[model samples]
Target: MKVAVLVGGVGRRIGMEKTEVMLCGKKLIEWVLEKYSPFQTVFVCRDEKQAEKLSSRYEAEFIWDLHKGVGSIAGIHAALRHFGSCVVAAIDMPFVKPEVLEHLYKEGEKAGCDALIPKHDYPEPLLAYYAESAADELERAILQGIRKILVPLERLNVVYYPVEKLRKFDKELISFFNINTPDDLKRAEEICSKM
Candidate 1:
């Protein structure tokens, strides 16, 4: 199946950098690429600069968000427009394992829902499954100024998979760990060293 990696986060929390962050002698995106290597991957970027650099480096197809500051909903919009059904994940979460992604894909295929989201008291929209069938609905919500991903999700046929299930593959739940600051980067480094 095809997958979309959202790279629009401004990284303001990490000094205006995200995927490009160096960790374990590799850019964060480089680490994420390992897990997605088996799939057809697309880079959904918010800024033209990010879009250009990532597309050039990864040699992957890229799509720009229709508007900036609309958050990941825009990336999801751009992705569904290009693909039928896609596994959508944030480029910042480099710890996500391929096996976890495989589980989400298999469950998404079998669930037959517009989305298959992981629950953490709320929907973790970033690392989830999306289908083209929900495109029109998502587009409508965005046009109506719906900024929260969970808002539109409530209107769709979504299956909320428990986060605990993911612990089977990621005991410490680092699969969802995201770096937003220098300290967070250091933590990621520690996690990386263990791996």
Candidate 2:
């Protein structure tokens, strides 16, 4: 299956583009790409500038978000539109392991749902499997100004992959961890050191 890494966010909280942020010895998005590069990977960027930079650096395919300023829902929509059924990972979530993604893909295919999202305390929509069928509904929601992912999710046939089951693949559930601030970056550094 194709994998799309959403790198469109402006990263205001972290004071710069989150994808470009350095973690350990590599860019944050590079850390995410390291595991998923085995697949047909695409970087869903916010604009041509971002797309050009990432595409040139990583030598991977890219697509710009069609619905601007709509947050991650736009990036997900772009991926669904371009790649059909695919796995979507947030650029800031650098710790999601390849095995967990494989499990998600396998289970998602077997379930044959509109979307298969990992549920920790709540649904982790940014890192999930989205079928191409979800694109139209998401587009409709975007046009209607429904920016929150859960709103669109309520209208779709969503399967929640629970945290209990996810633990078998990621014991600490670090796959759901995302860096949004300086403190989060520091914490990620600590996590990286251990790994």
Candidate 3:
């Protein structure tokens, strides 16, 4: 399956563009790209400029979300429209591991569920697997004025994969760590230093 990267974040909380955020001297999205390099990566952008620039810089496929103003719901909806079923990840999450992704996809296939999301301590809707089966329900939610990404799960056949299994790939359990602020960027940089 193809992997879709949500690059639509406005980055207001982080005080800068999410994808443009620097970590260990590289863009945040670049780190995510490396982790999902095994699959065909689709950059889900919020606008034409974003789609154009990121597509060229990464030399990968992209789709602009027309469902505007709905936050990540638009991004995920657009991805589902283009790819049917895909592995989704947030660009701000700099520590996502390749093996963790592998487990998500494989287990998603085994479960044969509509969605396979991670939940050890809590739910990780962003880093999950989605199929065409979810598109209808998701579109309904979007049309009903819902914007939260996890809200659709309440009505879908979702399987929560254990995040603890990810320890094999990410020992620090930082696999889900995301950069949402300057402090988060600093922490990621510190972690990079140790690596």
lDDT (CA) for every model shown? 0.82, 0.84, 0.80
lDDT of 3 by residue, 97-133 (tens): 7777777877887788888988887888888888878
Model 2 error, position 146 (Å): 1.8
Tell me which residue pairs clash in candidate 1. none
Give stretches of model 2 more than 4 Å off: 67-69
User: Per-residue lDDT for 140-181 in model 1, tens only?
Assistant: 777888887877887899999999998887787777887888
Give the per-residue Cα lDDT of candidate 1 at 100. Answer: 79
C-alpha-based local distance difference test score of model 1: 0.82
Clashes of each: 0, 0, 0
Largest TM-score belongs to which candidate?
Answer: 2
Two-way TM-score contest, 2 vs 3, winner: 2
Better structure of 2 and 3 per lDDT: 2
Shift of residue 59 alpha carbon in model 1, Å:
1.6
Q: Residue 7's C-alpha lDDT in candidate 2?
A: 83
Question: TM-score of every model?
Answer: 0.91, 0.94, 0.92
Model 1, runs deviating above 4 Å: 66-69
